[PDB]
Amino acid sequence: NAAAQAQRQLALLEQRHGVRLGVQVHDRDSDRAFSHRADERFPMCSTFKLLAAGAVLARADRGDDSLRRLIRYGAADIVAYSPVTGPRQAEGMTLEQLCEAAVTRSDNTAGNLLLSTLGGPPGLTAYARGLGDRMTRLDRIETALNEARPGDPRDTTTPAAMAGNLQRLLLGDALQSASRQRLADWLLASQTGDTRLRAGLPAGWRIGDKTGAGGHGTNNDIGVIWPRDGAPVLISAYLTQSSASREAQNAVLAEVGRIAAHAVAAWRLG
Numbered sequence: 001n002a003a004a005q006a007q008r009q010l011a012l013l014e015q016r017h018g019v020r021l022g023v024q025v026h027d028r029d030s031d032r033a034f035s036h037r038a039d040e041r042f043p044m045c046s047t048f049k050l051l052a053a054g055a056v057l058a059r060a061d062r063g064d065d066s067l068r069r070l071i072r073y074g075a076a077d078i079v080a081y082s083p084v085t086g087p088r089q090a091e092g093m094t095l096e097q098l099c100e101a102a103v104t105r106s107d108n109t110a111g112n113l114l115l116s117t118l119g120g121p122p123g124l125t126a127y128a129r130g131l132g133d134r135m136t137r138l139d140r141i142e143t144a145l146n147e148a149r150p151g152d153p154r155d156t157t158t159p160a161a162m163a164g165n166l167q168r169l170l171l172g173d174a175l176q177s178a179s180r181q182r183l184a185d186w187l188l189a190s191q192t193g194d195t196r197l198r199a200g201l202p203a204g205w206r207i208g209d210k211t212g213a214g215g216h217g218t219n220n221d222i223g224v225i226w227p228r229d230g231a232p233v234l235i236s237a238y239l240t241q242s243s244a245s246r247e248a249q250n251a252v253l254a255e256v257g258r259i260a261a262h263a264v265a266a267w268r269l270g
């Protein structure tokens with residue numbers, strides 16, 4: 001069967017490359033799933049920005065904050081990999097702009113400003129617990145959280161826990177309609193990840209994804225696949241302990257995408 005075939009291929013892929021690979025796939029159409037190390041801990045890196053944006057959107061839904069509120073921040077607050085917030089330091093950015101920069105561009109300062117709005121990393125963890133995720137924990141801000149030391153439980157999630165969060169946020173009732181659509185838009189618009197899961201999917205399919213990258217050869221890609229025919233598919237892919245280049249790591253994630261696409265295609269064909 002297709003799920004067993006996919007799990008077999010993931011075992012071979014992981015061994016060929018000497019990595020630790022964590023994958024959860026859940027197809028809403030057939031209700032089938034497959035996984036590899038899906039309950040093990042993996043460093044989140046930038047994938048936390050999906051939850052941070054969800055938490056801020058949920059506050060806006062309640063009137064606990066406003067997406068139009070302008071946030072001002074200082075030159076000393078700008079951390080590495082901040083392509084949107086860096087150039088806009090003198091002018092400030094609204095909460096909506098920061099959500100968009102964090103998700104679509106993986107802007108690290110934007111992620112940190114969202115965290116500050118939530119009260120810090122503990123606010124992110126508390127939000128995750130409210131979604132029914134008992135595993136994810138954020139302990140540090142960017143870029144300290146990208147250390148990704150093996151054996152360190154700080155700043156980790158599990159592939160299965162993050163797939164559960166994707167379902168709640170994009171397909172369930174965690175957010176109101178307009179907020180759910182905005183988050184989906186930002187994920188679809190991200191051109192980070194063009195050589196990761198996207199590279200293994202058929203060209204007629206679509207993917208809204210949030211990437212991450214960190215120390216110890218950590219490279220992640222999570223999101224929702226919209227196949228040519230049928231219902232959305234949740235995918236959560238975490239790779240770490242790679243001794244190879246980023247290009248080679250991206251190719252491993254592209255092969256995860258091919259494996260997932262073939263299983264979904266078989267589920268669509270019966």
Ligand SMILES: *C(=O)/C=C\NC[C@H](O)CC=O
Pocket residue numbers: 045046047080081106108143146211212213214215
């Ligand atoms: C998401 O993971 C955003 C950026 N990733 C790369 C790191 O910031 C590089 C330094 O830690």
Ligand SMILES: [Cl-]
Pocket residue numbers: 168169170171172173174175176180
């Ligand atoms: Cl939602």
